[PDB]
Write an enzyme that holds these catalytic residues in place. Structure first.
Site, short mmCIF file in Angstrom:
data_model
loop_
_atom_site.label_atom_id
_atom_site.label_comp_id
_atom_site.label_asym_id
_atom_site.label_seq_id
_atom_site.Cartn_x
_atom_site.Cartn_y
_atom_site.Cartn_z
N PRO B 37 14.75 22.19 20.39
CA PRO B 37 15.68 21.43 20.15
C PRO B 37 15.69 19.88 20.52
O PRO B 37 15.43 19.73 21.52
CB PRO B 37 16.89 22.17 20.62
N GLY B 38 16.51 19.12 19.59
CA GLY B 38 16.64 17.65 20.06
C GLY B 38 15.52 16.79 20.03
O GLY B 38 15.70 15.82 20.60
N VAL B 39 14.40 17.17 19.13
CA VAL B 39 13.33 16.47 18.83
C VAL B 39 13.56 15.49 17.66
O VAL B 39 12.58 14.75 17.52
CB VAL B 39 12.26 17.28 18.88
N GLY B 40 14.39 15.65 16.84
CA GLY B 40 14.67 14.87 15.55
C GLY B 40 14.34 15.52 14.43
O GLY B 40 13.79 14.82 13.38
N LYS B 41 14.53 16.83 14.16
CA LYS B 41 14.06 17.32 12.82
C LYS B 41 15.14 17.06 11.80
O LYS B 41 14.78 16.58 10.71
CB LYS B 41 14.21 19.05 13.25
N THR B 42 16.54 16.96 12.42
CA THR B 42 17.49 16.73 11.15
C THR B 42 17.69 15.22 10.99
O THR B 42 17.54 14.93 9.78
CB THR B 42 18.91 17.24 11.62
N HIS B 234 -7.78 18.57 34.31
CA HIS B 234 -8.35 19.77 33.37
C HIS B 234 -8.57 19.28 31.80
O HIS B 234 -9.66 19.44 31.47
CB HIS B 234 -7.34 20.58 33.47
N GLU B 235 -7.51 18.68 31.25
CA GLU B 235 -7.72 18.17 29.98
C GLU B 235 -8.77 17.09 29.97
O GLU B 235 -9.78 17.14 28.96
CB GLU B 235 -6.52 17.49 29.65
N1 LIG Z 1 12.43 11.06 17.66
C1 LIG Z 1 13.38 10.64 17.64
N2 LIG Z 1 13.87 9.09 17.81
C2 LIG Z 1 15.12 8.81 17.83
N3 LIG Z 1 16.25 9.46 17.97
C3 LIG Z 1 16.09 10.77 17.96
C4 LIG Z 1 14.86 11.47 17.72
N4 LIG Z 1 14.97 12.66 17.98
C5 LIG Z 1 16.34 13.07 18.23
N5 LIG Z 1 17.10 11.80 18.13
C6 LIG Z 1 18.55 11.66 18.23
O1 LIG Z 1 18.87 12.98 18.83
C7 LIG Z 1 20.11 13.56 18.12
C8 LIG Z 1 19.76 14.81 17.24
O2 LIG Z 1 19.01 14.82 16.12
P1 LIG Z 1 18.62 16.23 15.47
O3 LIG Z 1 17.41 15.98 14.65
O4 LIG Z 1 20.00 16.55 14.86
O5 LIG Z 1 18.39 17.34 16.51
P2 LIG Z 1 17.56 18.60 16.11
O6 LIG Z 1 16.66 18.45 15.09
O7 LIG Z 1 16.97 18.89 17.38
O8 LIG Z 1 18.73 19.60 15.77
C9 LIG Z 1 20.28 12.32 16.75
O9 LIG Z 1 21.54 11.71 16.93
C10 LIG Z 1 18.94 11.36 16.94
O10 LIG Z 1 19.61 10.25 17.05
ZN LIG Z 2 -7.59 24.73 29.22
#
Ligand SMILES: Nc1ncnc2c1ncn2[C@@H]1O[C@H](COP(=O)(O)OP(=O)(O)O)[C@@H](O)[C@H]1O
Ligand SMILES: [Zn+2]
Ligand SMILES: Nc1ncnc2c1ncn2[C@@H]1O[C@H](COP(=O)(O)OP(=O)(O)O)[C@@H](O)[C@H]1O
Ligand SMILES: Nc1ncnc2c1ncn2[C@@H]1O[C@H](COP(=O)(O)OP(=O)(O)O)[C@@H](O)[C@H]1O
Ligand SMILES: [Zn+2]
Ligand SMILES: [Zn+2]
Lengths: 409, 395, 409
Positions: B37-42, B234-235
């Protein structure tokens, strides 16, 4: 009614759940808390703790038992879980208490319902305003999937009360009843080691017979003796003290290790999940040494004919770990860097395991033999108090001109 | 509006989705995202939508049932404003059985050459139904890895631009001080420290940035830095053996970040795969000594040994045993174990000698990976060339 | 539409199914064909072959997948099978195609439906006018009951295409697209060994990106390299050639054996059922020798450090057979005529098995060492063509003054 006064003997758990209390009180103000898993022996106050958490935030309390979920027909339990979360969302904010969670957790009959439960845990977001509390008496059978992030990711142990905890619980329960002045609850707490809160309530209620005939110390003593006919005997207190003291000594004298916790004749705690860490050869040698402290102290003090079964749980883990060092992590020069068989290889493995265990055990025995007098002093203090702090341990050992490693949590 | 300018730290994913962007851009002449979660999928879905300049139809799988109890009307609306993207957050959430059946029947039934596409977001791929990955049904999947030092630095810049932090602050130290963070984590950190400055300023300073960083870190209260060093070594052993291979397949970019083809093989190739699997532990012992080896090689040590067995008991690659493959008498099992030990110890001595030969460039590579948390095979080759050691340019 | 032009690279399978085609066309005229079982890796054209068989006879095609039959409630799958045969009888003549048959085949949940399927296979007589085609990617798990007479009694393998097959498949798929003149599909076929028809279609479709940007060889090569990033490497081609060549040599030089099939670097084929035959000691020695040909050739040519895993499947069977000779068929003088234990007996058995295997392996190695030059010649021809005939093998070996046994099918 359930308030803060009704819980006693667990300030640490209260400090840990204060955050969830604030969450129930004001969901907006926080700028996760999803599932809280309470584990401990029966009668320690898990359901009482849930009711207190509910009453402190002044929110509803949705109580339910898994036992009535499982034993039903196909679809009963899953629809029950779904409709539960429907009620919780409709009656938001609230707590959904599920007693005996592990018994139900343990495709198939039981599994479909648990899947529905996990889908509910994942479905309600933090803006729904709800939380779920689960209590279990047997945690070893619980499915690890229940402890994943967003699904009962927080765990809490409810240890048995020591002298102070038992005294406070006795005071708490006494309020409803009109006891005599002569009674001394402190003596009762000092005379009932190893009891739970429900156990002590049973003592107060037991004196009801004396009130019926006539509450004075006579009734309290007659009822404690009746239930005993399981208070920890003083010899058991001494044994447990020496065991925990050996543990603390090995934790403190280890060359490199993690922080040491507060000593107490009460159990330390289990329910493993992802460790998500890595360790080296010396660190594992030291963890083994720690796990061997209690038994080494027992043998040094009482001799070879005094060692006890209290180290059972301990003695297993230690040896288990040793195996992981030879058969999984290749930390043996004799065996070599091979991880997984002919009898010769198993014999070599067993010989190396015995070598490691006996080496570390002789080491622990020598350590204890070196510092026997301060160990006796610490045991005396723990017996009189039933619970001391890591810092008090360091002080007792400093009194003998022995400077220990300053690592206390 | 959301474009790639708002996204940072994933050039590979951008290269992968350029095709979908071009498809959305030109329909006439002419997807499942998974990660923590929070990696920027949406955000990534919105960025693809804004790059192709097409509508963005957002929906959450958790909301499907009570909303679709329809999928047909959702895809109908998507087709009406085609070309466009239909983003379904919380795909795993998808009563549910019938709805999922409808969804898959639409994916296979709809000949979506009208110019529309479907993107799904999930946090747990192990729980996703494999049936959803059939051709015409999310045929390709993409992972969103966590940002390294440079990635975190760039994401910090992205959110920081809008609010103008204090002049003295330099994000590079922050990026070096937040291993294991996501983009959303950095957003919450910056916004929190700006809110704290408001509570205090209107020019957010390093002290406040720390006030929020120490707060988030305390929330975490932690992987010790020594664990980072161990993972790096290790890597690095893995990368050294794979790159130095007498014969091997391509080696991927090395990285200390958490991870969570050939048809037939010959004897030497299996010896070499074993050597690769034994690289990390060999490096650990060479650097820290016999008392420093760690448990990180567990899985590795397994595979290696496992392979050795397949070489003796399944592939008859042992002259002593002979060309016999498979109840067995103890003498045969003893011979098998002796040969396996011979192979493993031989390759381990070989690996130890190799590492002992090239310890200084290994130290250099470990330093670079520690400071960056992620280097490329090309950077590895360069670091090793800096010491007068020319490795094979095969990445 | 699906016609004969859409299938390529399997003339033998077409010759085998011509009879079923005639059956679908005219049921009366024949004066059995009941179930046809196609097996092969995914993407080899099983469903395409079924659709082509349906379109050639100009009859309906009833397609269905077992995966949706099994995963239902009690009664869903059996009623589904029954109603399927109802539709087929009502819409007679036609083909009932059941994809992923083995996955469903594998009382109990799945079993009742499969029983209904078998009862349907037995119920429709040859005057109903229908046939059933089944496709599977994993045949090893299939129930032998499905291969009994009148129930999918005929089996067919769809091997991977060689140079000619790949070229023809490329030509077939190219029709819909307007490629460039410069393209040479022959080079593509020679540069993509070990690919399936679907794999090559993916190459043609992959060049769609180049057409989008701008089809020329640049796109074809970029897409082949992309998918590769699994073409068989030239070293793998040489290894497979030597393996199949050792097999062919041992089959041809065996004192007494059955007919030898056409050589090809493509897999030979599995899915055993009732052998319904008997063999003697020498015949089993010779079958073992045959199964050991590939590895013997590998060692002779590349040495002891070159032997490969391609013989895995082979190496197993051979040894397995050897066991059946000692522990089931009493063909060992040392052990004696006892068939089925103390460790001594198991040791004797293992010693005899090793004796047999090493004897036959030294024999094969000596054979190869005797005729190394014609073997090299045959390997060269197979590499250049990827598929030769038994007769061409005999010719290559005759060119060296070596007269082999004239046994070719
Ligand atoms: N790779 C990234 N670069 C810049 N901002 C990001 C990135 N990933 C997440 N965010 C920020 O985090 C917030 C959540 O993004 P969101 O994609 O909706 O979360 P998730 O995909 O984990 O549900 C957004 O407001 C966005 O600005
Ligand atoms: Zn290994
Ligand atoms: N720590 C405690 N403090 C006060 N009372 C307790 C405590 N633990 C248990 N009790 C008493 O024991 C009884 C049982 O409580 P309950 O929470 O149902 O047991 P458990 O949670 O162990 O199943 C309650 O009536 C409660 O008053
Ligand atoms: N031998 C072949 N000749 C021509 N096309 C083929 C061949 N094998 C596969 N294909 C192509 O591959 C695709 C998949 O065919 P299908 O029969 O569904 O695969 P499988 O039967 O292996 O599951 C079809 O679109 C077809 O055009
Ligand atoms: Zn203990
Ligand atoms: Zn073979």
């Amino acid at each position: 009614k359930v308030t803060f006064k009704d819980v006693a003997g667990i300030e640490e758990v209260k400090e840990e759940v204060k955050e969830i209390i604030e969450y129930l009180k004001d969901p907006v103000k926080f700028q996760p808390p999803k599932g809280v898993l309470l584990y401990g022996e029966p009668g320690v106050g898990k359901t009482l703790l849930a009711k207190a958490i509910a009453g402190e935030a002044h929110v509803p309390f949705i109580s339910v038992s898994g036992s009535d979920f499982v034993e039903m027909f196909v679809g009963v339990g899953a629809a029950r879980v779904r409709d539960l979360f429907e009620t919780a969302k409709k009656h938001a904010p609230c707590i959904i208490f599920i007693d005996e969670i592990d018994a139900v957790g343990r495709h198939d009959e039981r599994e479909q319902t648990l899947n529905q439960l996990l889908v509910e845990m994942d479905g309600f977001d933090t803006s729904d305003g709800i939380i779920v509390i689960a209590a279990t008496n047997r945690p070893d059978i619980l499915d690890p999937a229940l402890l994943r992030p967003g699904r009962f990711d927080r765990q809490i142990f409810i240890p048995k009360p020591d002298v102070r905890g038992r005294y406070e619980i006795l005071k708490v329960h006494a309020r409803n009843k009109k006891l005599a002045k002569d009674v001394d609850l402190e003596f009762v707490a000092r005379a009932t080691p190893g009891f739970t809160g429900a156990d002590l309530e049973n003592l107060l209620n037991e004196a009801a017979l004396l009130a019926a005939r006539k509450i004075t110390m006579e009734e309290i003593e007659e009822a404690l003796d009746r239930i005993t006919m399981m208070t920890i005997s003083p010899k058991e207190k001494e044994k447990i003290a020496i065991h925990e003291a050996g543990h603390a000594l090995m934790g403190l004298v280890s060359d490199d290790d993690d922080k040491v916790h507060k000593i107490s004749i009460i159990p330390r705690g289990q329910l493993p999940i992802e460790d998500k860490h890595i360790y080296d050869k010396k660190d594992l040698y030291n963890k083994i040494l720690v796990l061997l402290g209690g038994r080494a102290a027992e043998e040094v003090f009482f001799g070879k004919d005094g060692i006890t079964t209290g180290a059972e749980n301990d003695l297993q883990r230690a040896t288990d770990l040793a195996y992981r060092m030879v058969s999984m992590w290749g930390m043996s020069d004799k065996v070599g860097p091979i991880a997984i068989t002919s009898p010769d290889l198993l014999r070599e493995i067993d010989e190396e395991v015995k070598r490691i265990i006996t080496e570390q055990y002789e080491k622990a025995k020598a350590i204890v033999e070196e510092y026997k007098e301060p160990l006796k002093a610490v045991v005396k203090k723990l017996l009189e108090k039933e619970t001391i702090t890591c810092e008090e341990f360091v002080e007792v050992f400093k009194l003998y001109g022995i400077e220990l490693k300053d690592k206390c949590k």
